[PDB]
């Protein structure tokens, strides 16, 4: 049995912990917040700030098999970069790739440098899409029909939002599984489903990884627009939501793949269906689709229910959020599991949908 140390116990942390458990690993969580979202889901929880008490993390590195940063606190990431050589185990992160991916303008410069299409900057005709340069989870992202000077202003690209994940070992780049990102009125993601292979998007994603070169994990997001694919962002950190869909649809565990990248290496390149979604239990049990910004306000996140083809997680707080995971051989069977999962909530917990 191997042990993974996660630095960060929110949404990235949950995803990493979930897949680590599927891989039969023990999960040690480090988080500065006593109310860290996944504190009770991890096998061990150590509450400290790694910047304030680095010696505690370095000591932990002697008794775990890897340390995975799963947060987007630049102060934390920059600090970890400064002490990474002192770790007694691998740090599963690409600091150079993250420096590029965290800044959307820097990323767009990178896309342009290797000839990858990306939305036009500063269009003359509405609608415009605006977003901050360095956020995530669609925070500050909005359509426009006194902005900060570094706000991105782009042409609004209509179409499907699609994600691919890539794990590189510095030499080989494993492009994994296409996923569809289902968006709500805030442009946040409330649902993820798998998609068939897209050779063009796979090649683009490979090239984005290869030109760094990536030793770590990165995802690529694109909009399949009316005039073709436009890459909107990359994020060189462990993603939330999509890795669960990747796991059930393709059989690939991204935590295992990332660990392999830093130990033995990776090789390039199941066809099953999966539905992953978030539903808030509103007033009187009204079920409402919500995105990650709502889950991020939660107080306690862990497993609620499981049967064959169904996993349900509950994010407690001011109105709970259920994260539902359904899988099966095809869309029909998966839809039937979704129906069963919802019926459990309906009959036993008074939900309405
Ligand atoms: N230096 C650190 N040491 C320990 N844990 C940290 C550190 N920096 C961030 N974290 C934890 O990582 C988790 C994810 O942080 P991140 O900044 O990515 O998301 P966030 O939603 O902005 O978090 P926050 O609750 O701070 O607003 C949080 O639970 C946070 O407490
Ligand atoms: N140029 C654009 N046109 C249309 N929609 C966009 C555009 N850029 C971003 N979006 C939408 O906003 C969401 C968040 O933008 P993204 O660049 O992926 O930032 P992130 O860091 O916040 O998640 C996307 O998933 C997509 O739905
Ligand atoms: N870093 C934040 C946001 C991650 C959003 C990724 N889609 C968290 O771990 O909760
Ligand atoms: Mg992003
Ligand atoms: Mg995004
Ligand atoms: Mg993303």
Swiss-Prot record:
ADP binds at residues 104, 131, 138, 154-157, 233. L-lysine binds at residues 11-12, 72, 240, 292. Mg(2+) 1 binds at residues 221, 233. Keywords: Amino-acid biosynthesis, ATP-binding, Ligase, Magnesium, Metal-binding, Nucleotide-binding. One of its GO terms (cellular component) is cytosol. Binds 2 magnesium ions per subunit. Belongs to the PylC family. This is 3-methyl-D-ornithine--L-lysine ligase. It comes from Methanosarcina barkeri (strain Fusaro / DSM 804). The lineage of its organism: Archaea, Methanobacteriati, Methanobacteriota, Stenosarchaea group, Methanomicrobia. The gene is pylC.
